[PDB]
C-alpha cells in the first residue's frame, strides 16, 4: 500500500534507501506516518538509488516472493543494511511505535520495471519498485 503522491519507485527509495536516522525508531516514522499504520518490519539497505538502478541491469530471475514473477534481480554482492523490527506496536498512536535495529551485510534481490510515464523522471527508464528478499 503506497500514498498517492508516491510512483512505485519513489515508494521504494522512501521505504528502502532514504534512512532518515540510523535509528529505526525515528527512521520508521516517516514510512509509518505516511503509509497510516506502523510497519512490522522494513530493511533499509545502505547503498545509493543509482547503485540499486544498476542491479536492474543484471540477468533476470525468479522472485523468491513471487515465483510467478521474472522481473527480480541479484545484488552480486553483498550490501550493508539495517533491518528494524516492531517492538512495541501502537495501533491508536503510531508515533509511539517502538523498533529494535539489526545490523547486517547481505545480498538482496530487487523487482524492476519501467518507470513511471508521467511522474518518474525520464533519467532512469529502469527502476527498482519492490525490494523482494534479502539472502
Same mark, same amino acid.
Given at each position: 500500500?503506497?500514498?498517492?503522491?508516491?510512483?512505485?519507485?519513489?515508494?521504494?527509495?522512501?521505504?528502502?534507501?532514504?534512512?532518515?536516522? =540510523? =535509528?529505526?525508531?525515528?527512521? *520508521?516514522?516517516?514510512?509509518?506516518?505516511? =503509509?497510516?499504520?506502523?510497519?512490522?518490519?522494513?530493511?533499509?539497505?545502505?547503498? @545509493?538509488?543509482?547503485?540499486?538502478?544498476?542491479?536492474?541491469?543484471?540477468?533476470? *530471475?525468479?522472485?523468491?516472493?513471487?515465483?510467478?514473477?521474472?522481473?527480480?534481480?541479484?545484488?552480486?554482492? =553483498?550490501?550493508?543494511?539495517?533491518?528494524?523490527?516492531? @517492538? @512495541?506496536?501502537?495501533?491508536?498512536?503510531?508515533?509511539?511505535?517502538?523498533?529494535?535495529? @539489526?545490523?547486517?551485510?547481505?545480498?538482496?534481490?530487487?523487482?524492476?520495471?519501467?518507470?513511471?510515464?508521467?511522474?518518474?523522471?525520464?533519467?532512469?527508464?529502469?527502476?527498482?519498485?519492490?525490494?523482494?528478499?534479502?539472502?
Amino acid at each position: 500500500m503506497k500514498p498517492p503522491q508516491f510512483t512505485w519507485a519513489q515508494w521504494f527509495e522512501t521505504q528502502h534507501i532514504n534512512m532518515t536516522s =540510523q =535509528q529505526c525508531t525515528n527512521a *520508521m516514522q516517516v514510512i509509518n506516518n505516511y =503509509q497510516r499504520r506502523c510497519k512490522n518490519q522494513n530493511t533499509f539497505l545502505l547503498t @545509493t538509488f543509482a547503485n540499486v538502478v544498476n542491479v536492474c541491469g543484471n540477468p533476470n *530471475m525468479t522472485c523468491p516472493s513471487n515465483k510467478t514473477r521474472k522481473n527480480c534481480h541479484h545484488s552480486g554482492s =553483498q550490501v550493508p543494511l539495517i533491518h528494524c523490527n516492531l @517492538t @512495541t506496536p501502537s495501533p491508536q498512536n503510531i508515533s509511539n511505535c517502538r523498533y529494535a535495529q @539489526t545490523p547486517a551485510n547481505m545480498f538482496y534481490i530487487v523487482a524492476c520495471d519501467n518507470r513511471d510515464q508521467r511522474r518518474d523522471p525520464p533519467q532512469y527508464p529502469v527502476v527498482p519498485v519492490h525490494l523482494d528478499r534479502i539472502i
